[PDB]
Each structure stands twice: as structure tokens, then as C-alpha cells.
Design a protein around this ligand. Structure first.
Ligand SMILES: CCN(CCO)C(=O)c1ccc(Cl)cc1Cl
Ligand SMILES: CCN(CCO)C(=O)c1ccc(Cl)cc1Cl
Lengths: 300, 237
């Protein structure tokens, strides 16, 4: 087990950790989250009781170090920090454990939701999308914009997702104009899989990370990335059979986990009605199709 | 953005631009097989590409051979239109390339944009106008060179004959749209008007009769009446 301890909780805040959310009152005695399952990336995030503007949070992996939360009264947020003194972090995690001022991450024996939502997400890739290498953990918020968004001001605060553009030279081979635009297999398989991502796990990792940033922070640019990487698979006639089956599982859990009340902004009518009913892979997403129709038949 | 009533006069400024119409690119005659089923038989078509300021027409003839062995021909027509338009731009000197291309149907936007990726400073635009360029095959000389063609062929015309010697582009475009709209509404009557006077000939290097200015007014009024009338006969008004 691993622990994200807290200095204190000086301002009323809603804390979410992966798919969960909970409330802490101003100066209630709160000193973090313990029993965090090792082996996955995690996200810890914050929505202040007073300014629901700006959800912000930190992606991290406990294997990569000892991380703690301190509220900064100058900058006005809960900041993730690293304790390099292993020996002294180990010690205070005990008094936190012994005074029972840490909540227990529910290690439920009937779930795999977080595993499944983060199967291919790896801290090393996250940190190439969110560039800030002095820290081992990665900060994200509501308002950060993507590299592609900045094209159409500050790039250090960028989400450096892989640029997908269906009406670009990268995507369209000269002389196969009609072919490559109606069947994107070349772009997915040769440009992106073999060229940029190298394998489908790195692709699937970005897709999953993009969906998670859209849901927990309502990052609009991430949602556009998620929908684009979905649309490119579904608009390719030729996809490794292994990818298709794994994609069905990925999307299944993303839709499962989505807040029912959030489906109006974060889901793109066009992309899904096309992926589920018009595209090459309309018959290859059985679980995803079934759960979309029982839950959100309105959108379709 | 889209081209409508409101920004109509942009067409006649000094920015080079072209209209592309694709309605006569893929043409069929539907018929019955011996088994009582229906098949199509394609006939030659045209891409109608027009400089509205100069009247230059680049008539690209689409030979029926281009369709042999191809599926989903109505979708293929739009990609072939775009491929041929980009080849025309590519073949022109840079200072002759258009700064805009206006497609008369929205289904052409994506095909052309994709074929024109090499030209990002060329704006591809739809229009909200119901332009009558489908009627271009009611112009005898254009229909004839399309039907006779044996191979792919580009033929160049000035669809305004010598009119610009005497009138402005705006007025010439208006006359042309009036003529084509009439031909579209009742070809027989439109044609009968143009030729009622056997003495007003069509010059070998022209498409339309050599009317005087006074005869153009008479003609233009007669085309207006036809277009109103055929509205009554259709709507009963
Ligand atoms: C002074 C060093 N320090 C905070 C940095 O000023 C601590 O020792 C500390 C206190 C509380 C917790 Cl949850 C973690 C830690 Cl590391
Ligand atoms: C699902 C349990 N629960 C109810 C959520 O509204 C929580 O508040 C909760 C979640 C996560 C953690 Cl680390 C601690 C706690 Cl108390």
C-alpha cells in the first residue's frame, strides 16, 4: 500500500482520487488518503467550495517517489510536493496512520474500474504530454489548452497531445485523396501506430488519458482529443483485430464511469452515431453499443 | 464563409475566383433490361468551372470511360471533380491561380479541400444561392462538344461572348444567370425566345446571338416574363 499525506486542509474543498470524490470542511482535521493500490497511475484533484471555476489535480505514481499535499496560501491551491527524505516521510505516515486522520482508499474486491480506465496509461507518457520535468508528478486543470488548440497563448502550460487532423497532408497521401479520406487505415496504421505511437498500447494510453482529463477536469481540449482518436479507429476499414476488441472494452468502461448528468457536453453526437452506426467498425463495438443505448439513447 | 445575397458583389472585385459546378459531371440515361430490371447507361459529362469576372469557362469534359469498373459513381463524381479542379489550378501560373473557389453544392467542400491541401491560401467556399449552372448543357455548342468528345478534353470558352466590350461584369453575370435560369425553367420556350428572329445570328466564336443593346433588353424582359409565368403554371397564381 502507499499514502498521499496532507499538511492540513485549511480551505473547504472537494477532493477526488480516481473515480471517487469526497468533501473536507474548512480546518477539519484531514491528513490525506492511505491504502492507495500500488501499480497504477493515480489522479488526485480539487474543487474549492467557493470557486467551482478551475478543477485542478495531479497525476502521479507512488512507485516514483513519496508525494504529499500542502495548501499554499500565496498561490491559493493544494500543491503536490515530493519529500526526498524517505526516512522522515515514512515516520509521519505512521502518526497519520495511528491518530487515524487519514481516510482509507476503498480497496473494493469487486471492481476493476480504475485498472480498466488506466490499463495503458503510464506516467512516462503523461509527463511527455504535460511538460514539467522538475517534478515526478503532472499538474492538469480545467483551463489548460492543447498544442493543436494553440495553433488555431502560453505553451509551457500546454497539453502536448498528438496532433490528429483528417484534412492534412499527414493524413492524406497524394493520389489516394478519396481513398485515404474515406478509409483512414493508412493514417491510423502507418502514420500513427507504426510511425508516431509505435504500438497500440501507447495510442490507447493517450486515448485513455485524454478521456480522464475531459471527465475529472472538464478539459475541453482533451475531450476533443479523445473523440478524435476514437473516430480515427472507427473510420479505418483495416484495424488489428486485437485493437478492436480492446477498444470495445476501453470505451465500455469510459461510458460506464461517466456521470449521467455530464453526457451533454463531453459526448460528441456526430462521432458516436458515426462510430456506432455508419462506420467500418459499427459491428465491432458490441459492449460499447449496448451500454450506450440502455443509458444514453437520447443522444442517438 | 458562405456566399449569399449579402456579399454578392465580391464576385466582381479584382480577386481572382472561380465557381465550380458539378451537376453535369456524372450523367445517366435510366432504362430497362430485358429481364425487366433497370440499369443506367452513362453519357459524357462536364465540370462547369467559371470565372464570373472575366467570363472565362474551363469546360472539363468527363468521358464515360472514367467510370468504367467503378462503384458508387455519384460519390466518385465529386472526387473526380475536385481532382480535375486542383489539376487546373496546378497548371496555371501562380498569378493566375484563384484566391477563392466557390462550389455550387455543399457536398463538394470536403473533396475539394482535400485535393487542394497544397494550396492553403486558396479559400474553398459554399454559397446560399440557387444558381442555374446545371442548365449549361442546354447551350447547344456546349452540349455538342461534350456529346461528341472521344477522350478526356478541356475546352475553353468565354460564356459572355463579347458582352464585356459594352457592359460590366456584374451586368454580364446577371444576364447569364437570367438566361440559364430561363433555360432551366422551360428550355423550349427559352430557346424559342433566343431564335425567334432568324436574322440575329450566333457568331462562330460565340455561344449566344449577336443582339444589339435594345434587343438584349427586349430579350431580357421576355426571359423574366417566362420565369414568372412558369411559376404561375407550377404554383397556380
Ligand atoms: C517543513 C517540512 N515539512 C513540510 C515542508 O515545509 C514536513 O515535514 C511535513 C509536514 C507534514 C506533512 Cl503531511 C509532510 C511533511 Cl514533509
Ligand atoms: C465511496 C466512499 N466515499 C463516499 C463518496 O461520496 C467517500 O467519500 C470516499 C472515497 C474515497 C476515499 Cl479515499 C475516502 C472516502 Cl470517505
Amino acid at each position: 500500500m502507499n499514502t498521499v499525506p496532507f499538511t492540513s486542509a485549511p480551505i473547504e474543498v472537494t477532493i477526488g482520487i480516481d473515480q471517487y470524490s469526497f468533501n473536507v470542511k474548512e480546518n477539519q482535521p484531514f491528513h490525506g488518503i492511505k491504502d492507495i493500490p500500488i501499480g497504477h497511475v493515480h489522479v488526485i484533484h480539487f474543487q474549492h467550495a467557493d470557486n467551482s471555476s478551475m478543477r485542478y489535480g495531479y497525476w502521479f505514481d507512488c512507485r516514483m517517489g513519496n508525494f504529499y499535499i500542502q495548501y499554499d496560501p500565496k498561490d491559493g491551491l493544494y500543491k503536490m510536493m515530493e519529500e526526498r527524505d524517505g526516512a522522515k516521510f515514512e515516520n509521519i505516515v505512521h502518526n497519520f496512520k495511528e491518530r487515524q486522520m487519514m481516510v482509507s482508499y476503498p480497496k473494493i474486491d469487486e471492481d476493476d474500474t480504475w485498472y480498466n480506465l488506466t490499463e495503458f496509461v503510464q506516467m512516462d507518457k503523461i509527463r511527455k504530454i504535460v511538460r514539467k520535468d522538475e517534478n515526478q508528478f503532472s499538474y492538469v486543470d480545467s483551463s489548460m489548452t492543447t498544442v493543436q488548440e494553440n495553433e488555431l497563448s502560453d505553451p509551457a502550460h500546454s497539453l502536448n497531445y498528438t496532433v490528429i487532423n483528417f484534412k492534412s497532408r499527414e493524413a492524406i497521401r497524394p493520389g489516394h485523396e478519396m481513398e485515404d479520406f474515406l478509409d483512414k487505415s493508412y493514417y491510423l496504421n502507418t502514420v500513427m501506430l507504426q510511425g508516431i505511437f509505435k504500438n497500440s498500447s501507447n495510442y490507447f494510453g493517450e486515448l485513455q488519458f485524454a478521456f480522464l482529463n475531459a471527465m475529472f477536469f472538464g478539459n475541453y481540449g482533451s475531450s476533443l482529443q479523445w473523440h478524435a482518436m476514437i473516430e480515427l479507429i472507427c473510420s479505418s476499414a483495416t484495424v488489428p483485430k486485437h485493437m478492436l476488441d480492446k477498444l470495445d472494452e476501453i470505451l465500455y468502461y469510459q461510458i460506464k464511469t461517466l456521470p449521467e448528468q455530464y453526457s451533454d457536453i463531453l459526448l460528441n453526437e456526430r462521432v458516436w452515431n458515426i462510430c456506432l452506426y455508419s462506420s467500418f467498425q459499427k459491428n465491432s463495438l458490441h459492449n460499447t453499443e449496448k451500454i450506450m443505448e440502455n443509458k444514453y439513447p437520447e443522444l442517438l | 464563409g458562405a456566399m449569399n445575397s449579402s456579399n454578392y458583389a465580391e464576385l466582381f472585385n479584382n480577386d481572382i475566383k472561380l465557381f465550380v459546378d458539378d451537376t453535369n459531371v456524372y450523367r445517366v440515361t435510366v432504362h430497362k433490361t430485358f429481364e425487366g430490371n433497370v440499369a443506367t447507361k452513362a453519357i459524357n459529362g462536364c465540370i462547369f468551372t467559371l470565372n464570373p469576372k472575366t467570363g472565362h469557362l474551363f469546360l472539363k469534359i468527363i468521358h464515360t470511360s472514367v467510370w468504367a469498373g467503378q462503384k458508387r459513381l455519384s460519390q466518385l463524381a465529386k472526387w473526380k471533380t475536385a481532382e480535375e479542379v486542383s489539376a487546373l489550378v496546378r497548371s496555371l501560373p501562380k498569378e493566375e491561380q484563384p484566391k477563392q473557389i466557390i462550389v455550387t453544392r455543399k457536398a463538394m467542400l470536403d473533396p475539394l479541400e482535400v485535393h487542394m491541401l497544397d494550396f492553403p491560401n486558396i479559400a474553398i467556399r459554399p454559397t446560399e444561392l440557387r444558381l442555374p449552372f446545371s442548365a449549361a448543357m442546354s447551350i447547344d455548342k456546349l452540349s455538342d462538344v461534350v456529346m461528341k468528345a472521344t477522350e478526356p478534353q478541356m475546352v475553353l470558352f468565354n460564356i459572355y461572348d463579347d458582352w464585356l466590350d459594352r457592359i460590366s461584369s456584374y451586368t454580364a453575370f446577371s444576364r447569364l444567370t437570367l438566361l440559364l435560369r430561363a433555360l432551366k425553367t422551360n428550355e423550349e420556350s427559352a430557346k424559342m425566345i433566343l431564335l425567334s428572329d432568324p436574322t440575329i445570328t450566333i457568331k462562330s466564336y460565340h455561344l449566344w446571338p449577336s443582339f444589339t443593346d435594345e434587343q438584349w433588353i427586349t430579350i431580357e424582359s421576355q426571359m423574366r416574363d417566362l420565369i414568372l409565368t412558369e411559376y404561375g403554371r407550377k404554383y397556380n397564381v
